[model samples]
Every structure is written in C-alpha cells, then in structure tokens.
Target: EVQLVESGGGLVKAGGSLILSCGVSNFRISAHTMNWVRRVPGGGLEWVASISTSSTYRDYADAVKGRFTVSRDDLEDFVYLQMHKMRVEDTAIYYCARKGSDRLSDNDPFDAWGPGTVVTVSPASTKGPSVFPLAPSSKSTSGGTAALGCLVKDYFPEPVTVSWNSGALTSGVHTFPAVLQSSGLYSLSSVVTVPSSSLGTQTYICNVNHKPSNTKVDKKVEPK
Candidate 1:
C-alpha cells in the first residue's frame, strides 16, 4: 500500500519559521508529483504549493508564493514544506498529497493524501487557555437526561482538546469550533450528555488539553 506520513507540526510563534515533512512509502519521490495543502479548522481546503515529478517544475499559490517553499529529497523519499514569517492565520492542518504519474498539472486532483499535521501559530506573546467549571447547557434536559458543558476561553493558540473522565463516551458529545474574540483571543465550548439518574451517583470531570504550553486543566462536577 502507498502511504504519505506527515510530521513536524505544533505551536509556532509569529514571525518564526517552520518545516514540515512527508515521508513516502512504496513509491519513488522522483516518479510522481507532490503537493502541499492546508485548511483552517472548519474552513475550506487550500492549495499551497506543488512540485512536479523529477523536481522539474514547481508551482505555488498566490497567497504563499513568496513565503513558502516546496522541495523534495529523492534519496530519502521525503517532501518538505518550509514556511517563513508565520502568522496566526497560518494555524491549520497541513497535508501532503500525491498526484498520479499521469497527471502533471498543479490543478489536477490528488490521488493520495497524508493524515495531516495540526499547526498552531501563536502571537509573539503567547497565553495559555483558561477552562471554566462545568455547567448545564442552556437547553439541557432534566429528570431523564442532562447536558453538561465546559467553556474554554482566552487562549492564544487555537488547538485544544476536551475529554471526559467518565470515558467510553462515544455519543451525545459536541465540541464547538474555536471562535476568535475581539480581544484577539480564542474561545471554545464542549458539551456532553448523560442520564440524569447517574449525576449524583458518579462524578464527571472535564479535561482540557492545551498543546501550546503542554498544559492540562480539569474541573469536576459531583453531587451537591
């Protein structure tokens, strides 16, 4: 099977540089074209750059023409995306894709794609996210079911993950997209539902994982 694995993504400060790599398997890097694509959370796909087979030609999108570079290492079978002077708007998931040998145009469809790497770009002054206590959702039901929500606000970097301590919660969970506030910070909210009968019998803890500073904060709601 053919595989394109991407790596080297995380928090980056404004005006800093970043290098992302994609390793290819079961194929030769010089035999097919490689492309780099990125998309912000909840946003549409965008083409960044493309390198033709045998590294004969390169094409870049207008937005990243001067700031981004695409190159390949035939000996290592790796494709790379180098970015300079990054900004907050650059925070997104970057993916490496492959175009079949028969297709050479940069606009042609990609036949293979990497899993993607999450890149979060922060301002010069980085700030960790603040997670609030768990509370009932505005539309929470009572007696039979209850919806619990946790609010995370004032985060510099947008990448965050929310989880429940109860575990095995595969349903009735919703996490809203991060919203940029007028203050230039980010806010996010997550909600999970459970049987009201279990509220007093067991405690539910909400854990928020912020990747920028490797910080984790959790709040628990118990019988009161």
Candidate 2:
C-alpha cells in the first residue's frame, strides 16, 4: 500500500513514455484500487486506466487501452501510471486517485482522492501565463455578473497569476488565501468577472499557471 512520487512534471508527447503517480498514507492500499486521469490543457478530462489490489486486476481503459497501464509497489505504498506513444494533445495534468470499493461506482465519477497530482507538461509547449480563454455553455450556468473562478489545488504562499483571454481589464484574476485540506494538499481559487456577452462562448475553462503545475481544467455552464 503506497504512493509514487513523480520524477518531474508530466510532459510526454502522445506515443511517448508517460508516468503519473499518487502517494498513500494512513490507510492500507491493499484495501483499495487506483486509477488515472488525463486533463488536457484547455479541454475536458479523460480516465486513462485503473489497478485494483483486492482483485489484483490492472488494465487500461478502452479509450486509452493499448497505450497505458497501471502498476503498484505495495512495499513502497506507491502506484505508478505509465503510457507510451504520447500525442501532442496528451499535454495536461495527470492524476492518480483511489477507486472506490465497488467497481461500478469506483469506475464512474472519481470520488476518492490522494494528495499529490502529476502534471505532464509537453516539451513542445511554450505556454506561459494562464491560458483558459473560454466560457461555459449549458443553461445552468450562474449568470448576471457571475464570478468566474479557477480552483487551484495544492499551491499556497505562491503568487498565483491569472489573466483572461477576452481582453476585459477586469479579467485579471485575484486569488483567495490558500486553503489546506486534511490531506495536506494546498488549494485556492482565483476569480474573474464574466461579461454578459461572453456568457455562452463555448465553455469556461480554469487555467492554472505555476511552477509546480501548469494544469488547465474546464467547466461549462449556461444561464440558470
């Protein structure tokens, strides 16, 4: 039962060698399963693979099968995620999370978590400055002077830089204080105001720019 420490940021070209990890503490990993997720920069999330200790089953997700695998070292309480033939689009934040006890539930939406997350930054990327330059789409989006927020995780005391793409002066971001979780990962949210015209500009994405991770995640919404 353990977790793997990433050697560095996850920046593999698609079809290249890729590795992501999670660290386990307090609980016995033998009692849980682990899985991986790939959040493309400025795009959506993808579940890459999973490993279950109780069943001793490890396999790649069909969407990512033939390109990824899950492995663990119980002696070290660490699980390592590996994939090969990385594509340029594979540039994103890869995370290691524990799957729930039940396969159906554990495999669906990720409900459990670990502290550390591994961001695979592409060597081809010259991206600097937060890059989420879109807005949400669905009708349920909070509207009318709504505050757009980027919930940055596991970073505190670090000056968070936030900028919007729409060219709104108010688009510059202001961050809240770091909020610590019981797991020791630091998190904070930076928000910008949403102009009425940009309400349905495809989708809203949160771009986090920093040294530890250059992860961009998206959440779309529409007027409620």
Candidate 3:
C-alpha cells in the first residue's frame, strides 16, 4: 500500500550540492506523498521540504524555499530527491518519508521513513553501511592494505556509500533507516582505515545525524 526509498549512495560533489536519492519501493507514488528531513550535525531535525507523486509543487518550511526537486522513475522503481546548493555542515543524512499528513502538519509527524541517505560534507571514502556486519576487533589494523572487509550481504544498493573514517573511530548510525525503528542498539562501525599512511586508526567518531546533538552521534570510540 505504501513504500519509501532512499539511496544508500552518498554522492557528494565538492561544494556543488548534495543529491541523495530516495524512492518508495513496492508502492504507488500516486497514492503517497514524500517529505524530506535532515539529521544535521549536532542538531535537531530541520524539515527540508515535501512533494507529492501526484503533484509537482514542492513545499518548504518557513525557513527555506529549499533547493531541490522530486521526480519518479517507474522504470527503475524509485523516486529522486535532487538538491543543488550544498554546504559542509550539510554533513548529515537526508531522508524521504511517506508522510501521513493530508495538509501541512502543525506538529509534522512522520508516518513512515525511507532508509535515509547519509550525505556528509566530508570525504566520500568515510561512508559506511546502514546496518553492517561486526568485524573482528584488534588493537590496530596495522595499515598497509591490512584487511579487506565485506558486509556478508549480497549486493547492497550501489548508491550506498562505503567509506572509512581514518580517525580514531567512535560513532556511527544511531538508528537504522531501513528498519525505521528507534531501537537502543547503535547501528554503525567505528571504521578503521589509513588514508595517508600505512598506520590504521579506528578511534574517530562515526556519527549518525540523529538530531539534537546529544542524540545524533552514536559514539563508537574505545577511548574518550
């Protein structure tokens, strides 16, 4: 009866814009409307905008006449949420929701959500999976093309960005976008990789844009 989809791919162009993809799988766009929201760094959710599959008008909250457009590609079975103006702190995830509101909601509660797309302003290589397989823990991966990790799942959405944070990793996805549930379990890996050198460090923070800085970052670092 309803579906909402978002790209796993975190395609970021240098200072150009952030264009993450969203689609409602196995549902008729004609029947459902799509709304956009963001989990920006260290902040609560900022409602970006919305569009209906049946209509072309885009709805932006009072703060912005947001820079984006929505389209459906039935052949591919996906809806596209396109945005052009980009910023560094836009370093967060963009989600397209199957909103349940018939009119502009006064409280704006989301009925359903797409497995949100993470669009950080950092390097593309720092992205990880929505829900990932746990890796064997070690003191240091000891760099030099040390290990090749895989999700064990077959063929995730190619758009899904799989990057590693070379920093001493700490945090990542706080909630599962696909699961769309608020489980207590943290959902991310403290990516351990080396970009500039052969020494790997998995102590950096792999934060999730959960909203309200206190909740957004799902810290995975072993040390403070």
- Name the best candidate (by TM-score): 1
Q: Which ten residues in a row have the lowest lDDT in candidate 2?
A: 125-134
- Per-residue lDDT of candidate 1, residues 70-187 (tens digit): 9999888999999998878888999999887355564666888999999998776457888776665444456658777788899877788988884556588888999999887899
Candidate 2 residue spans exceeding 4 A from truth? 1-7, 101-109, 115-118, 121-224
**lDDT (CA) for every model shown?**
0.83, 0.57, 0.50
TM-scores for candidates 1 onward, in order: 0.53, 0.44, 0.44
Task: Report the Cα lDDT for residue 51, model 3.
Answer: 73
Ranking by lDDT: 1, 2, 3
- Of the two candidates 1 and 2, the one with more favorable lDDT, higher being better, is 1
Better of 1 and 2 by TM-score: 1
Cα lDDT tens digits for candidate 3, 1-224: 55676774564643455456766655555555567788877867888877765565667765435566656554555667666665565566777776566554535467778767787654332223343334334443444333223231212222233333432332332222232124212232223333323323543334334221122223333321
Q: lDDT at 201 for candidate 2?
A: 66
CA shift at 196, candidate 1, in angstroms?
Answer: 68
After TM-score superposition, what is the CA distance of residue 150 in candidate 3 from its true location, in Å? 40
